[PDB]
Tab-separated table of C-alpha atoms in Angstrom:
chain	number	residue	atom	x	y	z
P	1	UNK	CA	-27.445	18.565	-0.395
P	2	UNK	CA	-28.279	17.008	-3.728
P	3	UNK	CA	-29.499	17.950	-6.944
P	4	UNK	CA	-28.573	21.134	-7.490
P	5	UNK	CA	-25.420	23.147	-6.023
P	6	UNK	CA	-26.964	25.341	-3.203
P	7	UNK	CA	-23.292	26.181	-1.715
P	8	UNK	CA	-23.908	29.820	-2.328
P	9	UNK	CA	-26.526	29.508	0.812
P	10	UNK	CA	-29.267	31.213	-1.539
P	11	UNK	CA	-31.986	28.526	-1.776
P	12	UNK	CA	-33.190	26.946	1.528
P	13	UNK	CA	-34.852	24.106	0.471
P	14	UNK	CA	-31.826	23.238	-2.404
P	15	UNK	CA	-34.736	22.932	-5.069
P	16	UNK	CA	-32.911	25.538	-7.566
P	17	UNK	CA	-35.213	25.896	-11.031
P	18	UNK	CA	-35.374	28.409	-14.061
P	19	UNK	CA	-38.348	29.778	-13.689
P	20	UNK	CA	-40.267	32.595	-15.154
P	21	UNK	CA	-41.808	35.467	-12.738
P	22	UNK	CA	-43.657	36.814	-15.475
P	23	UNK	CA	-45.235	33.382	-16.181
P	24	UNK	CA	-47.109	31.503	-13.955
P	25	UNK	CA	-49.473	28.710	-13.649
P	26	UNK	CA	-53.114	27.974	-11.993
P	27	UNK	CA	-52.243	24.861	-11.102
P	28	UNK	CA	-50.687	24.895	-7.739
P	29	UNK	CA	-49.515	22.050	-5.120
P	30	UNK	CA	-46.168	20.788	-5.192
P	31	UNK	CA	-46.727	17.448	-2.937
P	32	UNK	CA	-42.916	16.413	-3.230
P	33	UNK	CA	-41.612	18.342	-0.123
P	34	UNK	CA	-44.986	19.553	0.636
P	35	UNK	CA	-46.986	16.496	0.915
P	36	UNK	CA	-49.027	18.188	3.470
P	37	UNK	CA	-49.401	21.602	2.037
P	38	UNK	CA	-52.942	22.765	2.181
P	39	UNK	CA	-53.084	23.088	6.005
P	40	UNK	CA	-50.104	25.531	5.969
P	41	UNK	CA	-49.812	27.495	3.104
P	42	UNK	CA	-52.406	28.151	0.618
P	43	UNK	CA	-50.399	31.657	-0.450
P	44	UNK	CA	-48.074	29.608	-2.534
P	45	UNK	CA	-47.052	31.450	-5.821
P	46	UNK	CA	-46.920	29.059	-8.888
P	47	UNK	CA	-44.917	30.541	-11.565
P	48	UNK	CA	-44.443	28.707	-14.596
P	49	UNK	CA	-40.672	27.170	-14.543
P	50	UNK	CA	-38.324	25.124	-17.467
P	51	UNK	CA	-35.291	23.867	-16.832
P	52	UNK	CA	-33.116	23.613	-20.022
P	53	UNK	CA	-30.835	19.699	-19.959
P	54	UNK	CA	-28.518	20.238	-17.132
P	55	UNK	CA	-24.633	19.381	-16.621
P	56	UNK	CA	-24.512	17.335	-13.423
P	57	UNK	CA	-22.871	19.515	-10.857
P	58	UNK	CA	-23.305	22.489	-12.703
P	59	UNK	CA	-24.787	25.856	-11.786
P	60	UNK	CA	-28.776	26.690	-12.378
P	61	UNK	CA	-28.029	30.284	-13.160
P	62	UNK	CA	-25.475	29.432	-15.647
P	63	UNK	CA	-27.017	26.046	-17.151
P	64	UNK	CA	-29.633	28.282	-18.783
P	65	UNK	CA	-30.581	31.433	-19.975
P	66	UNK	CA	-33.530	32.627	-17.524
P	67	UNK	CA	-34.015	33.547	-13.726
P	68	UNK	CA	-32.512	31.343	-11.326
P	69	UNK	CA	-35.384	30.465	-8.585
P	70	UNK	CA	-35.329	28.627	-5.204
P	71	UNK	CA	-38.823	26.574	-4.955
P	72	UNK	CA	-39.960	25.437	-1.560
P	73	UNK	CA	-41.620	22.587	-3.712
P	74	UNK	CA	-41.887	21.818	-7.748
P	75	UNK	CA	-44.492	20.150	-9.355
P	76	UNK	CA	-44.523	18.062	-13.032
P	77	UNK	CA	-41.137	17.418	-13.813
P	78	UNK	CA	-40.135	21.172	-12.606
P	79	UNK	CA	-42.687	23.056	-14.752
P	80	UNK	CA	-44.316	24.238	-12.066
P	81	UNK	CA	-42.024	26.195	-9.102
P	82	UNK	CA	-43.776	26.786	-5.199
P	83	UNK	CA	-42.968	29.588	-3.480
P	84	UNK	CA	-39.496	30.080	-5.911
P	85	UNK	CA	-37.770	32.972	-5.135
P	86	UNK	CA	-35.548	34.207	-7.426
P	87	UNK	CA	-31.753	34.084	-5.632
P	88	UNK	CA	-29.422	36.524	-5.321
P	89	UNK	CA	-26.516	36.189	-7.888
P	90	UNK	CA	-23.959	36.696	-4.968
C-alpha cells in the first residue's frame, strides 16, 4: 500500500491515475509492474492519463478534476495508464 490511497478496495494493483477514456495513446507497455507483459497480455488499453501535482495522502478523485482510473501498469511519468479502469466512486 503506497502511493496512492486504495483503502476504498477499488484499484487492485494501488496504481490510481487521472486518466482520460476518451483519450488514448499508441504507445503501449507499461514495464514497471509488467516487466514481462508481452507474453500475457497484448489486449492492454492505453488511454492517455495526467495527473495534476498531488497532496501526499490525498485522494486521486478529488486531487483533480478528471476520471479517477486504476492502471494495472503506467508508463512515462503516468501519461500513459494500462489496463486503467475507471473506479467506482463508492
Amino acid at each position: 500500500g503506497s502511493g496512492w490511497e486504495s483503502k476504498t478496495g477499488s484499484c487492485n494493483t494501488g496504481k490510481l491515475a487521472c486518466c482520460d477514456t476518451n483519450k488514448k495513446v499508441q504507445k503501449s507497455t507499461g514495464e514497471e509492474s509488467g516487466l514481462l507483459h508481452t507474453g500475457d497480455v497484448l489486449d492492454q488499453v492505453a488511454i492517455q492519463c495526467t495527473q495534476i501535482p498531488l497532496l501526499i495522502g490525498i485522494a486521486i478523485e478529488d486531487e483533480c478534476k478528471n476520471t479517477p482510473t486504476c492502471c494495472e501498469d503506467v508508463e512515462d511519468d503516468g501519461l500513459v495508464g494500462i489496463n486503467c479502469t475507471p473506479i467506482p466512486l463508492i
